[PDB]
């Protein structure tokens with residue numbers, strides 16, 4: 001399931017801002 | 021004529037904003053006036069701590085930015101934008117900046133403390149919000165972006181990690197580190213990968229339409245429990261974002277999907293929030309038919325949930341972070357770069 005794929009990914013914790 | 025009441029409101033709000041924008045508050049407290057209690061979150065060049073103001077006993081959330089780290093990351097002008105805009109704005113769903121000041125080492129922004137914790141925390145734990153629940157929060161973002169955009173501001177970092185829930189269950193928008201006052205277009209690459217609009221990724225000029233794309237991502241993530249474009253690494257995320265394909269959980273109502281198709285619209289000439297009718301194409305969309313905009317603004321609508329409040333100064337709605345002692349160098353760092361702060 002997409003939910004299961006999300007939960008197993010490395011981006012369910014807090015996501016950092018990016019920039020140049 | 022609801023439209024004319026809105027214009028009047030926004031006109032006076034701009035008046036108030038400009039006075040403060042042209043004459044920013046500066047140096048309005050000192051570190052020793054606050055007892056530092058506990059870190060509530062972190063970022064690449066600083067942290068936000070719960071503090072208690074000694075003279076009043078009020079708690080606040082103090083963001084402490086290391087000047088040297090800001091410089092090394094090339095965020096000097098962004099940090100100046102942050103403080104100058106936050107001290108000038110006033111809206112029920114915007115966290116207030118109460119004091120700001122700096123010392124040899126750090127910049128300090130002392131803001132309201134929102135004890136309900138981040139939406140991020142609540143959303144990940146519960147999995148996803150029902151549509152009425154997501155719509156309640158979404159409406160507050162719509163009104164907040166209508167406010168900010170009318171002041172020529174682009175917010176540029178909408179996400180659940182930067183929305184707090186207050187004691188009444190309402191949203192407080194935090195993190196103005198990428199906010200910018202700009203008429204016309206701008207080019208910086210900034211935001212958070214899941215939430216970047218295609219035009220930011222493809223290095224085009226862009227404008228406030230990127231915040232409306234980000235609202236599309238936020239509503240999807242609130243209602244699905246995961247974002248519309250995710251992968252293990254940012255480049256994979258960008259490829260999805262620019263592909264022009266999006267798919268919706270089978271439980272999304274057809275009104276929700278129609279609204280999200282129009283927000284997650286790669287074509288700017290077609291993106292809701294960006295057409296002749298402006299924010300009105302969003303306020304009047306079927307998915308928002310149950311929404312009473314004025315009642316929301318007045319905080320008269322009953323919230324979906326009220327965070328547990330154990331008392332003043334309690335932090336149980338926030339994760340624990342490693343603490344580090346604040347050190348103030350005996351030499352001024354980066355004085356010229358941050359002179360107007």
Ligand SMILES: O=C(c1ccc(C(F)(F)F)cc1)[C@H]1CNC[C@@H]1c1ccc2c(=O)[nH]cnc2c1
Nearest residue numbers: 061062063064065066067068081133134181194
């Ligand atoms: O802790 C945060 C934080 C910490 C450091 C930075 C920095 F990168 F240094 F600029 C930027 C943000 C933010 C990130 N999202 C929420 C977190 C936060 C957590 C609590 C409050 C609060 O209670 N009041 C105002 N802002 C708050 C902000």
